[PDB]
């Protein structure tokens, strides 16, 4: 399996274009309200739509009759309708028995599905659904189906739909032209596939059929020609600002460089030269270079100029070396004066975001580019490309099975988790079921249960956390100290145990009206053991309110396991177990399961208060990789400082 995941954000491909879709998206890409044009697109469609309902309603009802009259004309030698699911060029009627039942079932359903897609075409009001699904169909159907028989079948249906309807010339012509498009697209052979050639050796070459880029909403492409009237020239410049700055900033804040605008309006500098000068401008520098790391600003510079994310590990490595050498100008210069930029946009065309629909996509930087094309990209300040690309070659990282966000910070108190929304730093990794996470023991390294399972109930001797035990006799256990004995020495020890037992369940010491006084005195009397006392504090409504309720279910399970057992979960096997209990039984039973677990009983007895036994490598790094606490012999060469021989 793969060791890294870039993310799997929802992809929404446009299967076919409708009139409302074509109208709305036209102004959406331009970042405008629907003007007198785009409103009139809808107005004429909504008026005709009532008639377009009557087209389909007749054709949906009489669908059985159209396909029956078609199949009878085409297929000879029996009845084709036994197993229902004008210009002849030179067709020969196909025998029913000779063609075979399996081929006949295909033939019949396609004839119905051709008419079905015609009815959808009128209702949509755009023959896009036809153009896509009919263009590259002649070639694939040629193998085991005659083309000559299909043309006359559609032409029969054209006449069949004409005679059955026949209302008005303003009504029937919609039926006629859509059928006329249908036969013309079917007569047309399969066009050449769109070949996305790799710009260098590092990036793979791709191919996309001439059907996928026929529906998936074409990105509006603006080119600065010197003769254009200044209204559409303004539309080009606004689009150029919408590409570089992700949004129209000249409308928002009136932030515009008129010095550069004037030169492009004339034709002194090209759009290639404009993008160059605009991306090295202090206006871009402040917004997409200054707030970001060198790696992330590089990743943003890719989508602004080239209109795509970095494709390969080698590409990020190359372009980071450029931005380290000469900075932002040198990076911009490398991006504009590339073989890719001049191939896609040339000199005149404004850069555009080439995503799922525009071109063929590679299976490498899918989710990394999906989040990048979003407007929420310049808030993810953690790089997504260089992180995933490096993690691809490496094995599985030190991470919780349900992501990096599921890992809490290894602190004394407070369940603090990285938020998915606030500062996107989600790092998915394909963890399987039987994947045990390597955990660092607080005590001796030999006392790890992975290598030494017998030494699970061994106390950390001044290496890890302090162990609290009810070793000493509880006050008022035996009737030796009769009535009096005001100075019973064994009283402060059990109270310190209670406080520590509170400190383990809830990281911090609680307030006055939060302490369970009933549970405390039962432990002090010797009615319940520590195991029962820890269980009661974790079964408290306060623990539910503070740690369980405000947090994500599996985050709350993970933190509870780090508090009750003092250990992060090894992997899926344990996490799925408690998550199954959380679904069926509830929170209280999850508490019960973690206490009544065998590993709890082995590590901590009936008198032992739980403690931090194991840390995550990331957690220990936070503790012992700071300026202090770090030893000299961790990751540094130690030279023996000896007095010189001349001294």
């Amino acid at each position: 399996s793969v060791k890294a995941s870039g993310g799997s954000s929802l992809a929404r491909p446009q299967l076919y274009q409708t009139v409302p879709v074509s109208a709305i998206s036209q102004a959406e890409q331009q970042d405008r309200f629907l003007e007198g044009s785009e409103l009139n697109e809808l107005t004429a469609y909504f008026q005709s739509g009532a008639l377009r309902l009557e087209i389909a309603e007749t054709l949906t009802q009489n669908a059985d009759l159209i396909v029956s009259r078609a199949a009878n004309r085409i297929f000879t030698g029996g009845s084709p309708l036994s197993y229902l699911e004008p210009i002849p060029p030179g067709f020969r009627p196909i025998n029913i028995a000779r063609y075979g039942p399996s081929n006949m079932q295909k033939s019949l359903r396609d004839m119905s599905w051709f008419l079905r897609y015609t009815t959808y075409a009128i209702v949509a009001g755009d023959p896009n659904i036809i153009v896509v699904n009919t263009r590259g169909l002649k070639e694939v159907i040629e193998n085991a189906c005659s083309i000559d028989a299909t043309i006359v079948a559609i032409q029969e249906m054209r006449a069949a739909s004409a005679d059955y309807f026949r209302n008005n010339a303003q009504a029937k012509e919609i039926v006629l032209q859509y059928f006329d498009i249908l036969l013309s697209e079917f007569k047309a052979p399969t066009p050449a596939n769109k070949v996305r050639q790799g710009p260098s050796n590092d990036i793979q070459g791709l191919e996309l059929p001439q059907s996928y880029f026929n529906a998936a909403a074409k990105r509006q492409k603006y080119a600065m020609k010197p003769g254009l009237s200044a209204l559409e020239k303004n539309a080009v410049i606004k689009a150029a600002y919408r590409q570089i700055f992700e949004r129209d900033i000249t409308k928002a804040y009136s932030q515009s460089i008129s010095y550069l605008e004037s030169q492009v309006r004339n034709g002194d500098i090209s759009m290639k030269e404009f993008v160059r000068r605009l991306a090295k401008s202090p206006l871009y520098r402040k917004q997409f270079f200054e707030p970001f790391i060198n790696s992330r600003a590089l990743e943003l510079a890719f989508r602004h100029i080239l209109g795509r994310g970095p494709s390969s590990r080698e590409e990020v490595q190359k372009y980071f070396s450029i931005v380290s050498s000469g900075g932002l100008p040198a990076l911009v210069d490398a991006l504009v004066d590339s073989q890719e930029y001049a191939d896609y946009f040339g000199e005149e065309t404004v850069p555009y975001l080439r995503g799922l629909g525009v071109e063929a996509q590679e299976c490498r930087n899918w989710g990394m580019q999906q989040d990048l094309f979003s407007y929420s990209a310049p808030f993810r300040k953690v790089p997504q490309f260089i992180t995933t690309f490096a993690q691809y070659d490496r094995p599985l990282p030190d991470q919780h099975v349900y992501g990096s966000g599921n890992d809490p910070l290894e602190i004394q108190f407070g369940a603090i988790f990285p938020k998915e929304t606030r500062n996107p730093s989600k790092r998915p990794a394909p963890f399987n079921k039987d994947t045990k996470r390597i955990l660092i023991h607080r005590g001796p390294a030999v006392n790890n249960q992975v290598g030494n399972p017998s030494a699970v109930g061994e106390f950390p001797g001044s290496l890890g956390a302090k162990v609290f035990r009810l070793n000493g006799g509880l006050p008022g256990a035996k009737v030796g100290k009769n009535t009096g004995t005001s100075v019973k020495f064994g009283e402060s020890s059990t109270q310190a145990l209670i406080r520590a037992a509170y400190r383990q369940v809830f990281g911090r010491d609680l307030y006055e009206g939060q302490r369970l006084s009933v549970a405390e005195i039962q432990l002090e009397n010797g009615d319940i053991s520590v195991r029962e006392f820890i269980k009661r504090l974790a079964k408290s409504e306060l623990f539910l309110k503070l740690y369980w309720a405000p947090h994500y279910v599996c985050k709350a399970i993970e933190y509870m396991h780090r508090r009750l057992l003092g250990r992060p979960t090894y992997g899926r096997q344990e996490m799925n177990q408690y998550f199954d209990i959380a679904s069926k039984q509830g929170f209280y039973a999850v508490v019960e399961a973690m206490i009544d677990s065998k590993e709890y009983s082995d590590a901590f007895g009936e008198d032992t208060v739980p403690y931090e036994r194991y840390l995550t490598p990331g957690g220990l790094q936070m503790r012992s990789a700071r300026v202090g606490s770090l030893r000299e012999d961790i990751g540094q060469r130690v030279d023996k400082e000896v007095t010189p021989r001349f001294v």
Binding site: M622, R626, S629
Partner: protein, 161 residues
Amino acid sequence: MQDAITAVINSADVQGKYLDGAAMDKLKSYFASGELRVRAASVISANAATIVKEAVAKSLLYSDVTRPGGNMYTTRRYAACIRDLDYYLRYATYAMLAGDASILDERVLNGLKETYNSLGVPISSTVQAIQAIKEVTASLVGADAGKEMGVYLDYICSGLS
């Protein structure tokens, strides 16, 4: 954690050398200041709630922080900040007794910035409160030991800012 004794021992152990004249003098300096450290800690221990009381009064109280909209508005969040400064003063006392700020990095400052950012706790307001602790502690304890406490309280501030 490591104290001033352990820090000298560890440094000598890393080299693989016996405790030399330079190492012995570092220990002797700690044992000279040992009487100053214990007496200082006892003063802080006795007036634990008192320092925090006059720290919040100076910096935090009667500000936008206490008033609605501020972070330290609710009684829940007020008692949280009191506890925080109670923790900060106690761990500064530990580092003062030890003569090393190793405990502060291990138990306090380990992902404290990431914690305070996520909750929405103001860094500048917290620093000022620890700065308020420093001035209160120095006025209570003394000049030399108050300076000693002031170093580790600055170390908390530097790790938080």
